[PDB]
Amino acid sequence: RMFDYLVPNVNFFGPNAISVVGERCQLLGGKKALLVTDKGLRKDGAVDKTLHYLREAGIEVAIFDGVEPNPKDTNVRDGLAVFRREQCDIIVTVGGGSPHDCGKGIGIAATHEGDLYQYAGIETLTNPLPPIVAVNTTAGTASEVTRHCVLTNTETKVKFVIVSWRNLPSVSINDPLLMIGKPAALTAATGMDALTHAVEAYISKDANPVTDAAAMQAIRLIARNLRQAVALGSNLQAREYMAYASLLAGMAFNNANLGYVHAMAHQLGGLYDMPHGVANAVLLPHVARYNLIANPEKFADIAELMGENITGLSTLDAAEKAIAAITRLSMDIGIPQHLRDLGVKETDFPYMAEMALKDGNAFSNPRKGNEQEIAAIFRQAF
């Protein structure tokens, strides 16, 4: 009946947006910055650019590149050792989801009483984190705009979530010039992740008109730009729109939550460490069809948003076109269409399905299923 809508205070997007990193640290009060990034991204001009604007604005910088794909709690432990030994004032995360998830963890662990795993759950944080300037490199996760901090436990080998308004970065930066170097396959997976965020947020039980505003636009932008962005990575106009789309999808799903697509994709990531992007892609249209009966009117909307002609059609028929439209986009941009080829096996369906209902994202799915109905979705996508 009532909703909250969280989003970073100050956000920057457009080509050359990276040029504000240094300036926005001066305004936040940051003297020294912990730059949190990947081993991969650290050798060209991505971390190098923010590193240039940081020293230009007179901000000292100790870097932490020890962030694994799937951010670990020991990554926060080792990361916090730098923040404390080098005495950093501000956190600058640069990369995809992983650097962002880790920078927040460091912010939490540096500000909240010893240990890290104990603060898992809802609004359970007491004191403000150190300022975080999250410069985002991927048109997919939108973590730079999210309330969510998800790390992986070393002890239990199971991920945990910390959901707090205090995890909202102080400033977000989305510069498409930093994204040009993404290989086609990667821009496709991150692109479908963004799509998945948009439709799941659009059809979520927690969907509202304010959230819809962002989700609808994201779906539209993705449908007009994802193909062209994977076609030619140097296409700036396409990159820009993909960047805005992903940021919009984030503003949406941060406040409306997701559904079964992520609930199932996290399991594929759990058992096979399949890339989160592709896991969402191959499942999307199968879960979307399953969700269809829950709100065919909004699926009719999705079709229209994706460019489909909808004129003389019953709502159910227009809804159908949304499914087709999603699989057409999926097939055009290279996405593998069957789990059979991603290494997945049929015996792991019951376990994954069981886990999927227990996943945090399942609660907001428009259709309340069971373990058998989820196993049938997997088999349809196999």
Q: What's the min distance (Å) between Cβ of 270 and a copy of itself?
A: 26
- Of 31 and 368, which CB lies nearer to a copy of itself in the complex structure? 368
Instruction: Choose among Fe ion, a copy of itself, none what residue 247 binds, the Cβ cut-off being 5 to 8 Å by kind.
Output: a copy of itself
- Of 86 and 373, which CB lies nearer to a copy of itself in the complex structure? 373
Distance, CA of 241 to CA of 201 (rounded, Å): 19
- Of 15 and 360, which CB lies nearer to a copy of itself in the complex structure? 15
For the chain, the maximum distance between any two Cα atoms, rounded to a whole number of angstroms, is 67
Instruction: Choose among Fe ion, a copy of itself, none what residue 314 binds, the Cβ cut-off being 5 to 8 Å by kind.
Output: a copy of itself
Q: Are 221 and 241 in contact (CB under 8 A)?
A: yes
CA torsion, ordered 356, 70, 380, 370, to nearest 10 deg:
0
Residues forming contacts to a copy of itself in the complex (CB under 8 A) are 1-17, 19-20, 27, 165, 168, 184, 205, 208-210, 212-214, 216-218, 221, 227-228, 230-234, 240-241, 244-245, 247-248, 291, 293-296, 307-309, 311-316, 328, 332-333, 366-368
- Of 193 and 301, which CB lies nearer to Fe ion in the complex structure? 193
Q: Are 325 and 301 in contact (CB under 8 A)?
A: no
Instruction: Choose among a copy of itself, Fe ion, none what residue 193 binds, the Cβ cut-off being 5 to 8 Å by kind.
Output: Fe ion
Enumerate residues 6+ apart whose C-beta is below 8 A from 14: 175, 176, 240
The residue at minimum Cβ distance from Fe ion is 193
- Of 193 and 240, which CB lies nearer to Fe ion in the complex structure? 193
Distance, CA of 286 to CA of 263 (rounded, Å): 13
Question: How far is residue 311 from each of residues 286, 296, 308, 317, 323, measured CA to CA in Å?
Answer: 25, 16, 9, 10, 17
Q: Are 129 and 88 in contact (CB under 8 A)?
A: no
Q: What's the min distance (Å) between Cβ of 141 and Fe ion?
A: 6
Q: What's the min distance (Å) between Cβ of 130 and a copy of itself?
A: 15
Q: What's the min distance (Å) between Cβ of 170 and a copy of itself?
A: 9
- Of 17 and 264, which CB lies nearer to a copy of itself in the complex structure? 17
Residues forming contacts to Fe ion in the complex (CB under 5 A) are 193
Q: Cα 233–301–175 angle (5° rounding)?
A: 30
Q: What's the min distance (Å) between Cβ of 8 and a copy of itself?
A: 7
- Of 10 and 120, which CB lies nearer to a copy of itself in the complex structure? 10
325 burial (CB, 10 Å; 0-12 / 13-18 / 19+) is: buried
Q: What's the min distance (Å) between Cβ of 373 and a copy of itself?
A: 9
Provide the pairing of β-strand 159-163 with 148-152: antiparallel
